[PDB]
């Protein structure tokens, strides 16, 4: 039941918060119906596609089309995975803008953070295009260098018992203290997951051959520091921006620099702290009493986290509504409607 509202009290234009997915799940046939039917979607898609092809040397859209299989692991390879997800993000948000919707608070996962800083009115479009180009090139040098695993337990148990068995694995993303993403050698992943299955708890593998926010991310630190040392100072966000680097809001002139980018690349993402502080900020105002989180992402994976992060002292009894427009196996058009 979603055609009819369930509200019973008057209001005016409850604001939304743009939840941006990470560089995780994806597939070959993104946005085909939206591209072939929605006009503004196609226009923004082609604009950003030409912008990125200026540096990649080829059109990213039909490049994603060129895959002969819906699931080839090279789709998870960052030199292809960053631009496709960025394209989908910009297309979806432009379509939302043409519908009259605007973000009020912006937050982004491991990859979507750059698009968050973009759509917060902080960085320019060309700056974002160059950033994603060079970051795709940088993450191209972490291909095959260790893999990731999404876990089915909390961080507390893992640090209490499982941390000292393999002191070579980092935790790249702290979604919530019931399921997080780890990063390191695949043998440590296999041993830890086999022990967890012996303990009876489920876990899910990941097809990415990368290691995000690990030791290897520092080998190209000099190259990234030279590539991105040309950015005009990042603007103060007229639309409040939440940083998932430390999981707290940061907003002043020049807080989003190459140092910030490297911290993104290396320091793991404290997503739980970010979302909890979003909820505290919501309760700390009155015009922000409701905010349907809008998960701009081709696969619903961050609504998996947000409701579980609602603070312990939450007098707001209403469940944070999560709306994912795109899920891979469904009809994109009707899901968007």
Give catalytic residues, as residue numbers: 110
Q: What CA–CA distance (Å, rounded) separates 263 from 176?
A: 20
Tokens linked to 143 = 């291909």
Of 105, 126, 127, which Cα lies nearest the Cα of 116?
105
Of 74, 78, 59, which Cα lies nearest the Cα of 28?
74
Q: What is the DSSP letter of 136?
A: H
Of 335, 301, 334, 328, which Cα lies nearest the Cα of 28?
328
Cα 279 to Cα 72, 154, 239, 309: the distances in Å are 38, 21, 16, 9
Tokens linked to 132 = 């994603």
Furthest CA-CA distance within the chain:
57
Cα 34 to Cα 67, 127, 131, 165: the distances in Å are 19, 26, 26, 48
Residues ≥6 apart with Cβ < 8 Å to 146: 183, 184, 185, 186, 210, 211, 214, 216
How big is the chain, counted in residues?
337
Alpha-carbon Rg for the chain, nearest whole angstrom, is 20
Q: What CA–CA distance (Å, rounded) separates 85 from 27?
A: 10
Q: What CA–CA distance (Å, rounded) separates 136 from 117?
A: 17
């Amino acid at each position: 039941s979603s055609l009819t509202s369930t509200i019973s009290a008057p209001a005016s234009s409850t604001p939304v918060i743009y939840v941006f997915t990470g560089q995780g799940p994806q597939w070959r046939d993104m946005g085909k119906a939206l591209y072939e039917t929605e006009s503004v979607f196609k226009d923004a898609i082609d604009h950003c596609d030409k912008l990125l092809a200026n540096y990649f040397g080829y059109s990213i859209l039909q490049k994603l089309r060129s895959l002969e299989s819906d699931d080839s692991p090279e789709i998870h390879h960052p030199i292809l995975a960053q631009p496709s997800i960025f394209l989908i993000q910009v297309g979806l948000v432009a379509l939302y803008k043409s519908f009259g919707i605007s973000p009020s608070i912006v937050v982004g996962h491991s990859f979507g953070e750059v698009s968050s800083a973009l759509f917060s009115g902080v960085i320019s479009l060309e700056t974002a295009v160059k950033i994603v180009y060079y970051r795709g090139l940088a993450q191209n040098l972490t291909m095959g260098t260790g893999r990731l695993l999404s876990i089915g337990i909390g961080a507390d148990a893992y640090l209490e018992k499982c941390a000292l068995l393999y002191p070579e694995i980092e935790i790249a993303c702290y979604n919530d203290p019931n399921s997080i993403v780890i990063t390191g050698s695949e043998q440590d992943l296999l041993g830890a997951k086999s022990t967890l299955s012996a303990e009876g708890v489920f876990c899910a593998f990941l097809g990415t051959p990368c290691s995000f926010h690990s030791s290897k991310q520092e080998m190209i630190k000099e190259k990234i520091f030279k590539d991105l040392s040309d950015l005009p100072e990042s603007n103060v966000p007229c639309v409040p921006f939440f940083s998932t680097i430390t999981g707290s809001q940061l907003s002043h002139k020049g807080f989003y620099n190459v140092q910030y980018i490297y911290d993104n690349l290396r320091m793991p993402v404290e997503f739980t702290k970010a979302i909890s502080n979003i909820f505290n900020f919501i309760e700390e105002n009155e015009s922000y009493k409701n905010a349907i989180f809008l998960e701009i992402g081709p696969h619903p994976t961050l609504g998996f986290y947000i409701p579980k992060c609602k603070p312990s002292n939450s007098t707001i009894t209403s469940k944070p509504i999560i709306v994912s427009p795109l899920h891979k196996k469904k009809e994109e058009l009707t899901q968007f409607k």
